[PDB]
Ligand binder design. Structure first.
Ligand SMILES: O=C(O)C[C@H](Nc1ncnc2c1ncn2[C@@H]1O[C@H](COP(=O)(O)O)[C@@H](O)[C@H]1O)C(=O)O
Ligand SMILES: O=C(O)C[C@H](Nc1ncnc2c1ncn2[C@@H]1O[C@H](COP(=O)(O)O)[C@@H](O)[C@H]1O)C(=O)O
Ligand SMILES: Nc1ncnc2c1ncn2[C@@H]1O[C@H](COP(=O)(O)O)[C@@H](O)[C@H]1O
Ligand SMILES: Nc1ncnc2c1ncn2[C@@H]1O[C@H](COP(=O)(O)O)[C@@H](O)[C@H]1O
Ligand SMILES: O=C(O)/C=C/C(=O)O
Ligand SMILES: O=C(O)/C=C/C(=O)O
Ligand SMILES: [Cl-]
Ligand SMILES: [Cl-]
Ligand SMILES: [Cl-]
Ligand SMILES: [Cl-]
Ligand SMILES: [Cl-]
Ligand SMILES: [Cl-]
Lengths: 476, 466, 477, 441
């Protein structure tokens, strides 16, 4: 852009070239001109006096956009669309007086935004699908690896690394379905006139409603949409922007939860992000391993959540057939939501492709904590061997207190099993202690739940996206 | 009691049926119902629970000592265990098989899902009624010209009915969203402390099939088709985002609609209903309340977004108190807005002569091109006509803005001999009905193709007055 | 209330009786009647024909509120203020036609809300001051106790338990100042008439501006405010609600950060919130130690942050001299913000009074991690003893990698010091290793920063609140 | 380049001054300035840094190879180290003393605080100008009657100037808030990796006094009166909440004002200097300002211990956009306020339509109710049921019952006499509250 002015970090640091391009002025104004060509083409076929020469001029000059002239004209007219009409007309002097014929500014403005929304959603969907697929592979691989469960972030009944990963995956699958739904539900604005009544076109076609309806259908079809709104004011209802940014906000929340979990696992030393060979962690310590990619995801996911309040507020105060207090806001929030989303999905894909697990750290933490969770199982085995529940409970309470004192008052390892092994009272069950403290037998149905979840819910969703799976996600 | 804070959602606004769904009676009755279903299903699958124990629990589902549960919660600092001990006091033989194998969320989360489903089922008919009443209004007024507004400045005419379709369309998107979310809800079922069902697997001595059947049995008794396969301790809090998103979106629609109605009241084109002994001056107070409450609905979406985003691992308890507030308030607020909006839509008054007057003020400026074209068709030169119309329009604009007068552009054209070829046409060239484009057809097409198909499922709940 | 309808958990579970009472209908409608009395009193003094009998009727019946009648009248009139005028007039038949004389509904509605906001802020301030004082005591006590620093939640240069506690305290001190500022900046609406012009009162006093200004001054003073707005529409500007709920949202953010830290320290086993003797953690495991109070604080702090969007949106669409789309929203968000805030501060005070530290767990974690952070100091001691910087660096890099592998690849304890002890190359510094790994010497200026911060910034702020310091914070849940 | 996304805040809206303050040139020049100040102060306190090294750094503050820094950031994945190595490349003699003892936030956070203060200093005069222009308008129109609106329905008359004071008062609250926040900003200073200054304490061989002086010296060179005593790695992110709160509040004020102006444009009573497009843009951007407050609230609330990096990317976006949006709104609002157009005859006409209904009580009192109730109902029916002008006065004029007051009807319906104390309130408000605030600017 130029380092002497503000540049959005979404453009200069974060988002992919593809998404940056979709929200560029080239893409936008090229699409405006495309829409003016389609209007002229359709109008000519329906019988307005537009010559093939005029159409040919416009077709030749679609990419030939003098941005300097349009800026100068916008300065003079204070109207972006008319600046581009006059600028396109300068290029195309024979076609000049039939460009924009019958239309209001939103014919190009709103229809271009809808085309952009659809294309932007189409870039996110494969990226999200890739993330889900990579995590699903990880989940399958680690379906049966026991790990300490956490509720209130305190030690809890064991889960597996893969099962925990399915918590993440499930949230993303709900996003995938939401994004798909919203993408398929988008309708074209079409040709509607200044207040949505098509009065201008009805006059041009001298009272022929059928021709007005066909014009709407023709441009809708050329733009690649199955359906147009029947009802609009000047604009498509800004409720559409709420629907889109809601599903992105929800996705942000999922990503934030996942990346927060990953950051905590990094503190625990159970799991880590990928690391580049020459990557530095800190100014003081290059070897320090910070989960910086996950941190960035959270940071940007938060912005995605924040942004939902823009279109909510905007839609809620749109007066009658349109007010222009939506316009500047939308220039910002629509682009930034998609660029932020794009960034988080590229980054999350990158993280999921390089996740490192440390099984021996996981095991160590289980050995520390499992003895306290297994006291009930040891009492029951003692009862089965002919002991009284109350005696066994008082004896386990005393040995657990000795062990708890070593942990908390002395900073030592949990030795509760070695204490039970060395007490004659528990000699009826000493031979069973290997069985009663097997971590795999404390994981419930975790590995089965993973298997069932991947077959029944995940793989069916992913099957449509096979062809986009081989792309690797790089970062700078 | 007026000596403590009472939520105005209970004391002023929401219907008794929505208030009841979020009551402690409803909640704790459902907890006990869920404990009965667990014991019933556990007994069938072969755990040593006696018919006497089950009979005790069945007898005492409604018999809730709230005072004792509060006292017990004070002692234990645990709401679910307080209700276990309290239910056990009632049912001394069954005490000690209540909650067997379950974690607290077995009653907590499953009850919230039952509540969400029932709350959505109350909103849906109300929203359908609102849409139906507005659709009736739209049909009735499909062809009534009214001044269009963009930038809230005079624009190409629309119709009262067509404008009403803007409102209706937004609400129809909400209706579909609410239905979707309602149908997508899954039961949590029986999952254990961390979602692995380890406790139940131990009770059934390693039999996975029995664990899966227990989950299926309680899910079915609760009236759900499907349970989650994957959970931690809780159902994913993403569900709360889905629900409160569609309510926030609805809030935004309602706010737009009620804002339009308030503006129409200033214009004197349309008014709310009025009681005979109502005290103000005619204020659109119901629409104002709708906006006020819709705003809160929009605000509330940030609660579940924030909550879900910081849920660590298999669950943290920092969701709980927040959810006690935002879930109930979202539904009670939504309920209130829909009842109130239905009431407004049933009594909308239109003033066609005020509408007409405003059209007469503004239409002459929008009709200048049509008058020039009629002059050209009658043998005028177009440049002459354009310069003459420009001068008379400027005189008329000056009378409107600089003198506060009525637009007299037509009387100026009538009194100029130059325009005598078209004086007889002036009634035709300024007919408001002919400036409305395809508005009335758009209404007709929209009601047949999009609105009536949505409403057909809700016929039986249509006759209720708000 | 009644268990057959929805009851706000802010009333039934969380907030103190004092805060619940300030937002009660009794408090509100009593204050309406008080304001009508003050108006009549002041109007009589300034010469309107209001009799002492009429004033006496009103004075007798301030607390004597027939809620059933007011509800019935509100049903009929659809106007809460007029319902209460007619209801007050029914018990005061002689005064009936001079109640509300010259005033618009906001004379009671808005002025009562301002009185409530001021009194609600006055309940929060001492609670926040107590929290800061309890944390300050903890900070002083633990000013010198080394603990592992965390950035990115990864091991970092050591801090102290007390210094970390000052991070918490500083945020709350910024809240204290904000709450005080907003509390002191509140102005009374006073008597302004329907559109803020006082036209009604100017007519009653037959053109005498001086009397209108005195009436405004008199009721303002009776309500205990130093200043009234000069400029209003029908209402006080709703920007005031933004100012108040902003500082509460900010406070929510501080509390959430603090309680999040405490929850993480509980996982680390370095610090815990208090526990009752008969408290249960889980229905599966009674002994499991959940930081449930901190979790509730976070949960409620979040709601406080969420609520800031209500008054922002409300103020931004108030048309002209007032629209009524503020009213229902304000009934909810003002009360809930204060009740939520009250709850969080009581609960946080309770937590701060019972914080337990486990120094041996803290020490153990330092022993695990400090060797990696102390490599530079060991190299420098080797250089000073006549070794080459590059040789020492290559040797320490290899032993650190062996030690890191034992930690991560083998799940072992950090043995880097035992590796350095067993390498002959480092024999010039083996005797120094106690000195070079002393945790106290890695804490920089932490304990001094605490001391300076408590003397210069904290204690000066607390001095005004001495007399309310001895109150203990109880929880029923 | 039109082939990538460009923020409209840069390409359409904000002033060059504000754009520049949030540019990468300004940022990385400030990083280098802070490294120079650190070296200067460190040398004075006795660390072995030569005058030549300091001179190299001073020469090359503006001389930033962005291409090299980007390449280095690609390799290292660390923005600050990339700029250390890049600054060291152009300053080979100084290379090994740059960043000595400091953590990355020494440049990152202190630069943001310098930026916040400079950005606030650009907004303050603009806001003061807006208030001054509106105050002029208010004084000029203090006595001009206009219809009051509550529920946007006709209400007791106010004046154009008095209504303008509603707007002004909100902006004055913003002015005070912005000033307060600007003056209360504290410098982070030199604090080390976790806020303990351990690194500096080691460099100065145990001398606390020298560490405290270093902190004081860089704080003074940056132009701040006060530094934090207490930090973690960062300045507390509560500061970002304080700043964006006052901007969100300002957004709300601007949105209210511009919403009022848009409604007055529909009424044809007041216009911008057809469509109130500038006011519409203000509202649109004000909304974004309000939205943004949730970013720093969320960010601060989940900052773990002595810092987590999940604040960083968010802050790159929201801090800049809040100030650029605010700047735009204030420039635009100033432009609007410089030549607001009033149409007194439209205002008068609307008063003539509505005043007769509000003046019924005054006519009854002059007579001293069922007769006025019946004629008002006839007149209301002509207005609403027939779309006619209010003829209540002509009905009273034509009824013999009211012949005792027919001559008084001009007096009893004079709009100026229905405005209460509006013009006095304006005068008192401008003298006592507004002008004292403006005098500093
Ligand atoms: O086709 C029309 O122009 C009809 C017109 N409605 C408009 N529709 C679309 N664009 C319009 C409209 N009006 C203005 N503008 C121009 O949009 C631009 C707004 O710029 P910004 O606020 O920065 O987003 C800015 O360039 C504005 O001039 C109406 O009166 O209904
Ligand atoms: O261990 C520690 O406490 C590290 C300590 N903390 C950090 N402070 C400041 N910046 C850091 C820090 N850490 C990383 N980074 C780098 O910040 C950059 C973040 O990039 P982005 O997320 O896109 O905004 C990105 O370039 C990051 O590499 C330090 O002095 O370096
Ligand atoms: N894992 C859990 N699941 C459900 N409830 C719990 C759990 N742990 C504690 N509780 C209780 O849930 C209630 C939460 O209260 P609150 O924080 O007010 O919503 C308290 O009574 C807690 O003791
Ligand atoms: N201008 C006004 N000022 C204060 N209260 C009003 C006004 N107009 C109507 N009210 C009453 O205030 C109450 C608002 O109710 P709600 O919208 O539920 O808060 C209703 O009883 C209204 O009739
Ligand atoms: O004082 C009231 O009740 C109403 C005032 C209004 O309509 O503005
Ligand atoms: O109370 C429970 O059932 C669970 C608590 C926990 O997960 O610790
Ligand atoms: Cl169009
Ligand atoms: Cl379990
Ligand atoms: Cl369960
Ligand atoms: Cl008043
Ligand atoms: Cl340091
Ligand atoms: Cl530093």
């Amino acid at each position: 852009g130029s380092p002497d002015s503000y540049r959005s970090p979404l453009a200069s640091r974060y988002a992919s070239p593809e998404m940056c391009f979709v929200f560029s002025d080239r893409y936008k104004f090229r699409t405006w001109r495309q829409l003016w060509l389609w209007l002229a083409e359709a109008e000519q076929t329906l019988g307005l006096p537009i010559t093939d020469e005029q159409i040919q001029e416009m077709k030749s000059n679609l990419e030939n956009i003098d941005f300097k002239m349009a800026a100068e004209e916008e300065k003079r007219l204070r109207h972006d669309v008319m600046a581009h009409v006059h600028t396109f007309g300068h290029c195309c002097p024979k076609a000049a007086g039939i460009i924009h014929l019958g239309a209001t500014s939103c014919y190009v403005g709103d229809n271009t935004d809808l085309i952009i929304l659809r294309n932007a959603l189409d870039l996110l969907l494969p990226k999200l699908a890739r993330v889900i697929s990579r995590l699903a592979d990880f989940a399958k691989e680690r379906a049966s690896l026991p790990t300490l469960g956490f509720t209130h972030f305190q030690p809890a009944q064991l889960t597996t690394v893969g099962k925990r990963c399915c918590l993440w995956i499930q949230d993303l699958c709900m996003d995938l379905q939401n994004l798909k739904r919203v993408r398929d539900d988008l309708r074209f604005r079409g040709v509607k006139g200044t207040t949505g009544t098509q009065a201008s076109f009805l006059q041009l076609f001298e009272g022929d409603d059928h021709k007005v309806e066909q014009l709407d259908k023709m441009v809708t079809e050329k733009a690649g949409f199955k359906r147009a709104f029947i009802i609009t004011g000047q604009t498509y209802t800004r409720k559409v922007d709420i629907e889109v940014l809601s599903v992105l906000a929800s996705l942000g929340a999922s990503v934030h939860k996942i990346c927060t979990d990953i950051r905590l696992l990094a503190n625990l030393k159970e799991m880590e992000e990928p690391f580049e060979k020459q990557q530095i962690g800190s100014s003081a310590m290059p070897y320090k391993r910070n989960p910086m990619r996950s941190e960035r995801c959270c940071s940007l996911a938060r912005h995605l959540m924040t942004l939902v309040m823009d279109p909510l507020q905007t839609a809620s105060v749109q007066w009658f057939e349109r007010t222009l207090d939506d316009s500047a806001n939308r220039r910002i929030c629509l682009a930034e939501a998609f660029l932020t989303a794009d960034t988080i999905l590229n980054t999350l894909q990158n993280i999921s492709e390089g996740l490192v697990v440390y099984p021996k750290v996981i095991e160590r933490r289980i050995r520390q904590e499992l003895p306290f969770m297994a006291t009930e199982n040891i009492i029951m085995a003692m009862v089965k061997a002919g002991g009284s529940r109350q005696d066994c409970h008082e004896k386990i309470r005393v040995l657990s207190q000795q062990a708890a004192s070593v942990v908390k008052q002395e900073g030592g390892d949990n030795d509760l099993i070695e204490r039970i092994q060395a007490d004659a009272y528990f000699s009826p069950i000493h031979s069973q202690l290997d069985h009663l403290l097997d971590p795999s037998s404390f994981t419930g149905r975790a590995s089965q739940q993973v298997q069932r979840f991947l077959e029944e819910e995940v793989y069916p969703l992913l099957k449509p996206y096979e062809s986009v799976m081989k792309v690797k996600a790089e970062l700078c």
